[PDB]
Amino acid sequence: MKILFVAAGSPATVFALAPLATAARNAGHDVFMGAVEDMVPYIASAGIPAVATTDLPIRHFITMDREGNPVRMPETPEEELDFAGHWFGRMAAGSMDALREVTANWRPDLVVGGSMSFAAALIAAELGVPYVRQAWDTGDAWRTDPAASDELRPELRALGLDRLPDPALFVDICPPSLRPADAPPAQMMRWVPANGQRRLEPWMYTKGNRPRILVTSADMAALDAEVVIATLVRAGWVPLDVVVPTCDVVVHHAGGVTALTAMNAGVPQLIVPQGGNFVEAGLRISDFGAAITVDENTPEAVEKACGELIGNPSYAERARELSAEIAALPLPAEVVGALEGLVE
Amino acid sequence: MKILFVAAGSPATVFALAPLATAARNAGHDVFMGAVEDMVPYIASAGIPAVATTDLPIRHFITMDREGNPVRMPETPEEELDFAGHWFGRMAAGSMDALREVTANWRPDLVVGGSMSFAAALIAAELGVPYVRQAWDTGDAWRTDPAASDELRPELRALGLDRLPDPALFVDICPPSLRPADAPPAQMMRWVPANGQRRLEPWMYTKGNRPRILVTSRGLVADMAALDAEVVIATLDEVAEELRTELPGVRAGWVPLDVVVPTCDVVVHHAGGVTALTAMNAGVPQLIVPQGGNFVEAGLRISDFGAAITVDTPEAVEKACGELIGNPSYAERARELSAEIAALPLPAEVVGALEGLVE
Numbered sequence A: 001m002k003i004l005f006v007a008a009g010s011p012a013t014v015f016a017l018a019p020l021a022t023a024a025r026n027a028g029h030d031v032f033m034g035a036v037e038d039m040v041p042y043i044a045s046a047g048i049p050a051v052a053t054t055d056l057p058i059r060h061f062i063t064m065d066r067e068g069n070p071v072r073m074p075e076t077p078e079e080e081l082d083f084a085g086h087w088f089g090r091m092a093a094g095s096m097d098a099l100r101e102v103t104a105n106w107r108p109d110l111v112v113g114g115s116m117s118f119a120a121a122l123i124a125a126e127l128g129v130p131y132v133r134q135a136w137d138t139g140d141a142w143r144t145d146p147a148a149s150d151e152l153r154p155e156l157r158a159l160g161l162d163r164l165p166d167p168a169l170f171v172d173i174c175p176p177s178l179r180p181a182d183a184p185p186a187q188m189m190r191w192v193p194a195n196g197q198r199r200l201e202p203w204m205y206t207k208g209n210r211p212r213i214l215v216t217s218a219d220m221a222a223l224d225a226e227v228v229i230a231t232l233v234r235a236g237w238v239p240l241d242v243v244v245p246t247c248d249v250v251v252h253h254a255g256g257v258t259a260l261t262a263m264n265a266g267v268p269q270l271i272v273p274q275g276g277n278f279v280e281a282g283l284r285i286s287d288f289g290a291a292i293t294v295d296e297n298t299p300e301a302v303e304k305a306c307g308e309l310i311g312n313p314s315y316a317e318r319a320r321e322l323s324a325e326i327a328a329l330p331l332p333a334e335v336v337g338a339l340e341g342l343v344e
Numbered sequence B: 001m002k003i004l005f006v007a008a009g010s011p012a013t014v015f016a017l018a019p020l021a022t023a024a025r026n027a028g029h030d031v032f033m034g035a036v037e038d039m040v041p042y043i044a045s046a047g048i049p050a051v052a053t054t055d056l057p058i059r060h061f062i063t064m065d066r067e068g069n070p071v072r073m074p075e076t077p078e079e080e081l082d083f084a085g086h087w088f089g090r091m092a093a094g095s096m097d098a099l100r101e102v103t104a105n106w107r108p109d110l111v112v113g114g115s116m117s118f119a120a121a122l123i124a125a126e127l128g129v130p131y132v133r134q135a136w137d138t139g140d141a142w143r144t145d146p147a148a149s150d151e152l153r154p155e156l157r158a159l160g161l162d163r164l165p166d167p168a169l170f171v172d173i174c175p176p177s178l179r180p181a182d183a184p185p186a187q188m189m190r191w192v193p194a195n196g197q198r199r200l201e202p203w204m205y206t207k208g209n210r211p212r213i214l215v216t217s218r219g220l221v222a223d224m225a226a227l228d229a230e231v232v233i234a235t236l237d238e239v240a241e242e243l244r245t246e247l248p249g250v251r252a253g254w255v256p257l258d259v260v261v262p263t264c265d266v267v268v269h270h271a272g273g274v275t276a277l278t279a280m281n282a283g284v285p286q287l288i289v290p291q292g293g294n295f296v297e298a299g300l301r302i303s304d305f306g307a308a309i310t311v312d313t314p315e316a317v318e319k320a321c322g323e324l325i326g327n328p329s330y331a332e333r334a335r336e337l338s339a340e341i342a343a344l345p346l347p348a349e350v351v352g353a354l355e356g357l358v359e
């Protein structure tokens, strides 16, 4: 069958969907993935045929309303949820022209969207084909829905709907221990780490004598550890999937799929705020005991936390528990059958 | 487990192995793929972690022996088989230092090589882990082995072997109807078309009413474009700008075969690599050309089956094209081959065979 995957505005939204997309391709399905123009190279880097859904970047939808007037960044966790619902809603509305033109020439039998790829729900409803929602991180997929519903009121009304439609299938990659008490039924799936590739250097897969700390996007100068900085004491391009398993600490902001890659490898995490706000997903990992949550702008806080994550085995113990949970989940190749069941 | 894939010197050798490698990765295995430096970006383009097995290009192994002496180019299919055995052998010998170094730090539990990735057999024997040979096209995987076993006699001797070892498993992607009478037993696998990707443009996945003929990497464009069919020319990026300005109004340049082939009525190629499989998979008739007069056997078998024409010149390509479009037989035979391919075990299932070899 033809399956259209719909990612969003950032590389993690592409890679969240890559394992299922590639599994579907490997089962003989014809698979396209769409995202904003800036993300098309990221889709291509996963080896998946790539289409653009808008020629505007995520910043355009984040920083301005539909009329082009500037909108401020959110300041609280509650504002975060609401503001994100709106920007993802704007991006979705802005994606419809290109999705219509693509699907007029290559008509999918099934549409798969990430957590807040709301254009996937809309185009699926327009075509009358089933819509699958895949969680693109361990955060609650539905958490921005009320605001997104309000943003998309006009588009939803044109389809005869009062709110965002329920998916035909919800596919969840969150380990059971981290799923909220109010989580809906889901087809579970093991997310297998994936990211773009270049050429591996020996250090990427060979750990030295000292503890290895990966920072994704001075402190650490007294730890006597090997620090690797993953950018655009070694710096530069770092394939997370290959390098994370060699690490003892991963330092990130719980945006994207980095937390999942760390948990999958049983590696303790140090989680800093994203903007001025800790991400809810990251707090739940911290609560479980597989990470430490820390404000970087307190001097020595990061240094102290790294020391704790390296010297106290319990964090790694909890990380390996999460790793075990992930490994027990249905494979992407298995989940392809659930997709097939929706159209036959 | 850790699985090392070993491709070779051309993009098809990478893409031939990509479906099983990505399926193994998707099953939770740690997967690396090695090839010559020039092919590393092609491995990367498949989304697979990539290591270089040698910094030397394929031309070095083809044109000179290990001692720097020039090698005489083959003039016949028979000479070609011995010639390829020796040059793939030299490429394999030149790959061992890097493979030794990689596997000292990241030790695989299993090694999978393409048809003539002989360094895969050598490194697996040295490590004492199972070796899987996967056919990388519909041609006979073993057909250069005698010359390859001569080329690698010293490396093989050091491992206590008199010739190239039998793989622990042979995985074959050749449709049953095209397998020769003497084909060895295999685990069959459905090959799924894969290649590098870049932004799709609408023409790539839109078929028109007018027949579409794909040429893989002038008088033909003028001829064929009068008036029945359009021609799409797949090229490398070095010559894409040159050919566009030499042939205005023609789709020429980067072409993703997996996306474009299903829209075509004919695929025109020389039967190297995985193009024949991509055409057959989509049920598309093929026009096969020779490089001088060095007919690829795999292509002759597809023509013998009736899903392709092998034609020897500017005017005669036009003729075979009219035939492959006009006579419905050719597409009928191609769809039969497509059906045979769809019935073969999925890469996701074949991963279970790899797992069974270690446990």
Ligand SMILES: [Mg+2]
Pocket: none
């Ligand atoms: Mg104002």
Ligand SMILES: [Mg+2]
Pocket: B150, B151
């Ligand atoms: Mg000899």
